[PDB]
Design a protein around this ligand. Structure first.
Ligand SMILES: O=C(c1cc(=O)[nH]c2ccccc12)N1CCN(c2cccc(C(F)(F)F)c2)CC1
Ligand SMILES: O=C(c1cc(=O)[nH]c2ccccc12)N1CCN(c2cccc(C(F)(F)F)c2)CC1
Lengths: 304, 304
């Protein structure tokens, strides 16, 4: 038993972390096969930061201006291209440590592991969720750009996130591995509206199922609700609307505990309308939405 | 910016995880050099579980009864010994993936990374703290025994914890890598008093320093206190007494923020006596004690 914010083992991804230097700027790259992927703002000076013309800036750059370093060995850049907001530097050596991988675009409410890197060196790993407003509440300092988010299915690493920037609000924005930003964000040092963030209702419910499994049952009640009634409370409290798909994905946790999904929604409804009254659920004094039903299922079943 | 419960990159430790089978029991082992370390209760049947005579049980076991498997390759056990509550199985092959390592005994209040394993396979990684009552609030299911806790200084992995058992209270107990249990716990399926757990006061203060650095300053006040006055509040609220050593270790965070340590104790004193009033500090509705001053310093400075 026990419930923790668990990240995937990061080893398969530490082997792909490299340092990318272009001019006086240094950030992290992702070396898979003979390609190193990195944020295209690596070619930025502090003058053009406000609104860069990346095509023109890249045109002044040649293979030999990108310096790719893996720990201590220099990689030979034989090609360079821009794919949306990422650079794909072609190198003459395939990464011997390349795992089985896919590049995937995750959906809001989905969770992934982040490997924070500085100078191509992994410094830590944490689990986070893509907020419905397409931001992540991560932990990143100067030099963290190019740090990736991923999931791991047995031996296959699905890369979903590349770190690009921090919004003035302290939240983080980045792209998928094809350079497509999650959200309306652009790689410009300009004021960007983060957007209204809602709570991932299916995930809070999944985390309530983990609480029942792990001993915490104080919040459980004699009440029930309908999807329509519950959603009125979710709208009031800026929670994501609960759909029948969400009810389906919660089927396994409903079966494991014996608590019908709408009975858990009623417990959640009361927690929203009345608060925790100074009590805790799984060691927390607030409702947690960064655990998907798959995460709770995995952490309470034991998938390696 | 951003504050997350960050674990160390787990790669160096995934390379040392093996499966240890003895009879019908399977748990995890730690392969460093030509030795595999594992919990000695691997030699237990379900009859002797209540009070095993481990010397007698080990006497009925020979090298060939311990099955060490690393992914798919079988290791040849050429020796076996009991060191406190761990078995040291000598194998004919040195682990090619052995990192620079030390075996260290951590102190209560100290934090480490755990790599949870099932069948010698890493399934996830999380950061936790050794509670003052020498327990850890981890996340472990059947087959997790032999999962280790560690810290990483640049390239050197300091192993500090080996997972052994779950107390009926849902908290976890285990040994250092020499087999010495943290706390009064014994490797017996018997009722064991967990002990009173206090809050790691220096760590909560360090986490309050991280909050100021990361933007959260609502809790800051015009008051101050003395070490003696503050400690009266800490005693009342079951917090660890704050010593002058704790004040010294907080010197760097005090210098970074400009807030004298006793001014932060006064903010903490008010939070203890008045609560958060429904507000949050670093995304949490309770005071967090699982970040040491070194962890906050590292996460707010960027050490890789
Ligand atoms: O490493 C970081 C950074 C990331 C982060 O998430 N948090 C921080 C907190 C404090 C200081 C720096 C950071 N940088 C340097 C590169 N930066 C940059 C440069 C050129 C152009 C752009 C662009 F986004 F506008 F394209 C962006 C973005 C900020
Ligand atoms: O893998 C686990 C386990 C660990 C854990 O932390 N949480 C769990 C939650 C649900 C089910 C099992 C566990 N086991 C199996 C081996 N066990 C054992 C066997 C023989 C002797 C002993 C001894 F501690 F008494 F020595 C202990 C201890 C429990």
């Amino acid at each position: 038993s026990g419930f923790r914010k668990m990240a995937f083992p990061s080893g398969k991804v530490e082997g792909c972390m490299v340092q990318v230097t272009c001019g006086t700027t240094t950030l992290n790259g992702l070396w898979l096969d003979d390609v190193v992927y990195c944020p295209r703002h690596v070619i930025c000076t502090s003058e053009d930061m406000l609104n860069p013309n990346y095509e023109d800036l890249l045109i002044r750059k040649s293979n030999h201006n990108f310096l790719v370093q893996a720990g201590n060995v220099q990689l030979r850049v034989i090609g360079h291209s821009m794919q949306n907001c990422v650079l794909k530097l072609k190198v003459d050596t395939a990464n011997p440590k390349t795992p089985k991988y896919k590049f995937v675009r995750i959906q809001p409410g989905q969770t992934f592991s982040v490997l924070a890197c500085y100078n191509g060196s992994p410094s830590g790993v944490y689990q986070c969720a893509m907020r419905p407003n397409f931001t992540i509440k991560g932990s990143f300092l100067n030099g963290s750009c190019g740090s990736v988010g991923f999931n791991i299915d047995y031996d296959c690493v699905s890369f979903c996130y590349m770190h690009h920037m921090e919004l003035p609000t302290g939240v983080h924005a980045g792209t998928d591995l094809e350079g497509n930003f999650y959200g309306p964000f652009v790689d410009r040092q300009t004021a960007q509206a983060a957007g209204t963030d809602t709570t991932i209702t299916v995930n809070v419910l999944a985390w309530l199922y983990a609480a029942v499994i792990n001993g915490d049952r104080w919040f459980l009640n004699r009440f029930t609700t309908t999807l329509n009634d519950f959603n009125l409370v979710a709208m009031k409290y800026n929670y994501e609307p609960l759909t029948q798909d969400h009810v389906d994905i919660l089927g396994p946790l409903s079966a494991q505990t014996g608590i019908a999904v709408l009975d858990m929604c009623a417990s959640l409804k009361e927690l929203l309308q009345n608060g925790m009254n100074g009590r805790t659920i799984l060691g927390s004094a607030l409702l947690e939405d960064e655990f998907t039903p798959f995460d709770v299922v995995r952490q309470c079943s034991g998938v390696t």
